[PDB]
Amino acid sequence: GDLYVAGCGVWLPPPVTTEQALAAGHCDRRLASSTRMLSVAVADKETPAEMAALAAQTALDRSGVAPAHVDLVLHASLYFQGHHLWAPSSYVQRVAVGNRCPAMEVRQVSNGGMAALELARAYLLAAPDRVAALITTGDRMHPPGFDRWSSDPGTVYADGGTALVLSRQGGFARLRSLVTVSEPVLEGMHRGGHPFGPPSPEEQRAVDLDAHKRAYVAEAGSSFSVARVSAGQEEALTGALEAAGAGLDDISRVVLPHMGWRRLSAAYFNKWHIQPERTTWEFGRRTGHLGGGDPIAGFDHLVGSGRLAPGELCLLVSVGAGFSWSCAVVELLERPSWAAA
Amino acid sequence: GAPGDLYVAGCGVWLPPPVTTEQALAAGHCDRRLASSTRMLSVAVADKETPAEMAALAAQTALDRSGVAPAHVDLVLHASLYFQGHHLWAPSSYVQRVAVGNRCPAMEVRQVSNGGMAALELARAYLLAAPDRVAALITTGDRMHPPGFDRWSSDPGTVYADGGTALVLSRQGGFARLRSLVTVSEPVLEGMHRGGHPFGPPSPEEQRAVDLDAHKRAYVAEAGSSFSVARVSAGQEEALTGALEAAGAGLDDISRVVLPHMGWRRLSAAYFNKWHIQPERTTWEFGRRTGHLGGGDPIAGFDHLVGSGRLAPGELCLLVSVGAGFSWSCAVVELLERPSWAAA
């Protein structure tokens, strides 16, 4: 009883070029060069749930699934959703679905999209009469709290929404495997306070992940850190491929996080020895890191541009602070009508 | 019991020291009118502890009491409704590192004040979706401090507490059985807790001091007071009746009702004068000394009832929870035995 992907979609605001960022002083020459980012999607006034809802409408329309058959709505994100004590998943449900199933947030930092997929799968499988689930992501990474170029140097953060419709009934792709790996010993890498003590008091101040990474490594050790990160990634990869009865050579396209060149090279290209041309590198480098929606955006790009053929397998690769890793193997069954040739 | 029965195997809270209404009056946080309308006696307030800390502390109590091995914890879910202290950081992973020490998936679930029950819904699904799974840990934690939040006036009529709660859910066994759990959603009401047009897109970000009363008035003006009240009422009724019917029970069959830790005025309008039940049959006295624990009230309330021996074997408990959105969850829980951590 494998599940299906029935629809997917994105809403991306207009790109800002690396050239404009250089001219505005947001990016410097070394950072442009190390990341090799071409542009990043940047929202003027659209808010995260707004962008999530626009993406959901597209994904639902494409899926053909009726509102009455959406049994769950999960909205994932990693940054402030705009209003405290307010329900962004309810906005998404109101705007994009119009139905009355449960709607809630799921977060797992940059692995939020896949985390929601894990829980949505369980939800659909937990009762015989359930049909589809809507997963969305949305984030808006603006000043003063965040610097999309320098809060986490090496990765350039985008504004935008993504959505996927998961179904037990049918769809244009089959979810062949989905595996999540957890190394919570690394949780201290993304906060202040002692890595093996309680979190430091809250600031305030703009997000600065580099400062926390340096402190974590100083305490835990560089060798320990790198090895444990590599191990988690390896476990998710191998876990997902084995569960689908596949090897990396059987994968036609790999959906990777939208990190800069140097990070992807270290984590993936020079590690697994896969070619960048077989991945979503070119798409990601124009888009930026979409909170927890990268693997949805990248899969959506691959399918919509006809780069994936019936019977071909796609590997989704996602990671977030925590750390958590998810990999999934998806088999494309048919080219959907919204796709290009 | 039967296969697919779910049980509460453990629970616990971590509550920081109470600040009395008197202290709040003296300090200017509260005026005598709010004190009188809410009838609050005290609220749990943390000095230095952060939300995941309090969650992990509560989780340690709940896991120890449950006697469930870390290897048998198949999922960790952490619910909350306010800033967790560090952006792009994983509070659920902190809870996992500190309180569980294992490698199952750990994530956050949020549904505002209904978060604990939303996490319970997904925990239940996760456990039932695979034959081999055993237990799941659910935690809540929140720290409602200035300058971002005013626990007495950010949402007048409810006084917010700092603290953590936790519950261990199991397919294997426990001291209580989950007889039903039902969640209701009325998303037409989402605009009530935000700026922007209630039926248009949200207004730009507001990290600033939270002020719900302002957004609520705006909603009612556009949507209509009559519409607003009726839809809130209907959602609450659907969750209640759905949970009772699913359990084979009527309200008369319920020994204790776990209510949100709201102020007396809000509880009277939504529950006491509507359902015609007595405060003594609810967690009113506990809540009025505790305050609104983010999405964790029904866990703290159930924990209180079991821990103080108020609930007896064979008796049924009704959990009542609600959050902005709006979302409602009700659950019927049957106490099977008095656990060893309880008194009589």
Side-chain angles (χ1 to χ4, degrees), chain A residues 45 47 49-50 72 74 78-80 82-95 98-110 115-116 118-119 121-126 130 140-146 152 157 180-205 207 209 212 235 321-324, chain B residues 48 50 52-53 75 77 81-94 96-98 101-112 118-119 121-122 124-129 133 143-149 154-155 160 183-208 210 212 215 238 324-327:
Chain A
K45 70 198 198 314
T47 70
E50 183 180 3
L72 184 65
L74 303 184
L78 51 55
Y79 193 56
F80 184 51
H83 301 269
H84 289 296
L85 276 61
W86 164 72
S89 336
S90 287
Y91 176 91
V92 173
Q93 178 177 50
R94 178 180 70 71
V95 168
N99 71 342
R100 293 146 77 172
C101 74
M104 64 211 76
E105 291 184 80
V106 171
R107 314 187 109 181
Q108 202 181 55
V109 205
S110 300
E118 282 280 12
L119 297 190
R121 162 167 70 171
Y123 199 79
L124 296 185
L125 289 176
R130 293 175 179 155
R140 177 183 164 92
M141 317 303 293
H142 277 243
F146 203 87
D152 181 10
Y157 287 74
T180 294
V181 170
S182 192
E183 292 290 344
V185 75
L186 300 165
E187 63 84 5
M189 195 194 294
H190 290 68
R191 55 159 177 93
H194 193 290
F196 309 111
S200 66
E202 130 210 345
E203 264 133 39
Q204 249 75 124
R205 104 134 61 204
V207 180
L209 294 196
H212 297 319
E235 191 172 352
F323 277 42
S324 295
Chain B
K48 296 310 190 310
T50 72
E53 247 177 280
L75 184 70
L77 302 177
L81 53 60
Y82 192 56
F83 185 48
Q84 291 295 282
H86 301 273
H87 289 288
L88 279 64
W89 165 72
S92 312
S93 289
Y94 173 96
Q96 178 170 62
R97 183 178 62 79
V98 168
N102 69 346
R103 302 201 241 166
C104 70
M107 60 208 82
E108 299 177 76
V109 173
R110 321 189 97 182
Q111 203 181 55
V112 207
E121 284 273 11
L122 303 184
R124 160 167 72 172
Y126 199 78
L127 289 186
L128 290 177
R133 291 177 185 152
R143 172 186 170 85
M144 315 303 287
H145 278 233
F149 201 94
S154 282
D155 179 11
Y160 289 67
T183 302
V184 174
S185 193
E186 289 292 351
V188 76
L189 295 170
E190 62 88 6
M192 190 192 296
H193 286 66
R194 65 160 169 87
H197 188 280
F199 305 106
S203 61
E205 126 186 327
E206 169 168 338
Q207 305 224 353
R208 31 128 140 31
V210 177
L212 300 187
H215 296 322
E238 189 177 342
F326 269 51
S327 291

Side-chain angles (χ1 to χ4, degrees), chain A residues 236-302:
Chain A
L237 171 64
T238 295
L241 292 170
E242 281 296 324
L248 195 46
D249 284 342
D250 307 308
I251 303 298
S252 291
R253 299 297 188 178
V254 182
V255 172
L256 293 181
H258 300 175
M259 299 173 197
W261 184 252
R262 179 184 285 169
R263 279 178 172 167
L264 294 181
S265 296
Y268 306 114
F269 304 139
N270 297 326
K271 199 119 182 63
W272 299 347
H273 304 305
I274 60 176
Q275 290 297 271
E277 294 75 19
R278 256 172 71 202
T279 80
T280 51
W281 166 239
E282 295 286 351
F283 172 72
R285 78 191 296 216
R286 286 171 174 81
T287 299
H289 185 41
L290 289 155
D294 281 4
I296 295 164
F299 179 68
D300 177 85
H301 163 82
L302 281 179

Side-chain angles (χ1 to χ4, degrees), chain A residues 28-222:
Chain A
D28 66 24
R29 281 164 106 118
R30 284 178 168 269
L31 190 58
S33 160
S34 62
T35 63
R36 295 187 68 213
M37 290 302 293
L38 295 185
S39 60
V40 58
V42 171
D44 175 12
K45 70 198 198 314
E46 286 82 6
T47 70
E50 183 180 3
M51 298 185 271
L54 293 164
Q57 297 179 298
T58 301
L60 275 166
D61 285 349
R62 292 177 171 171
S63 67
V65 173
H69 286 157
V70 177
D71 291 306
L72 184 65
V73 176
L74 303 184
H75 171 69
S77 60
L78 51 55
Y79 193 56
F80 184 51
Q81 293 297 281
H83 301 269
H84 289 296
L85 276 61
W86 164 72
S89 336
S90 287
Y91 176 91
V92 173
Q93 178 177 50
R94 178 180 70 71
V95 168
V97 196
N99 71 342
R100 293 146 77 172
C101 74
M104 64 211 76
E105 291 184 80
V106 171
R107 314 187 109 181
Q108 202 181 55
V109 205
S110 300
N111 202 48
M114 303 285 92
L117 192 51
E118 282 280 12
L119 297 190
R121 162 167 70 171
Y123 199 79
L124 296 185
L125 289 176
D129 50 352
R130 293 175 179 155
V131 179
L134 176 62
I135 289 103
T136 69
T137 72
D139 272 305
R140 177 183 164 92
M141 317 303 293
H142 277 243
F146 203 87
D147 187 311
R148 73 177 72 251
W149 292 91
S150 72
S151 284
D152 181 10
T155 299
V156 183
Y157 287 74
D159 308 334
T162 70
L164 184 142
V165 176
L166 186 67
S167 173
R168 304 184 58 169
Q169 193 181 106
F172 67 89
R174 205 69 183 272
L175 183 66
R176 307 257 62 150
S177 69
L178 166 61
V179 168
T180 294
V181 170
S182 192
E183 292 290 344
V185 75
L186 300 165
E187 63 84 5
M189 195 194 294
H190 290 68
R191 55 159 177 93
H194 193 290
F196 309 111
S200 66
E202 130 210 345
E203 264 133 39
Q204 249 75 124
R205 104 134 61 204
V207 180
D208 186 350
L209 294 196
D210 183 73
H212 297 319
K213 186 181 191 304
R214 281 186 299 114
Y216 182 86
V217 165
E219 191 64 31
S222 197

Side-chain angles (χ1 to χ4, degrees), chain B residues 251-284:
Chain B
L251 201 36
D252 285 324
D253 299 313
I254 304 298
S255 302
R256 299 295 168 188
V257 178
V258 174
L259 291 179
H261 300 175
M262 308 196 279
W264 171 262
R265 192 208 68 188
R266 292 198 173 156
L267 296 178
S268 282
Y271 308 113
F272 301 132
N273 308 339
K274 193 136 191 44
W275 293 349
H276 307 303
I277 59 175
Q278 300 306 313
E280 315 92 65
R281 195 147 135 255
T282 78
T283 56
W284 162 243

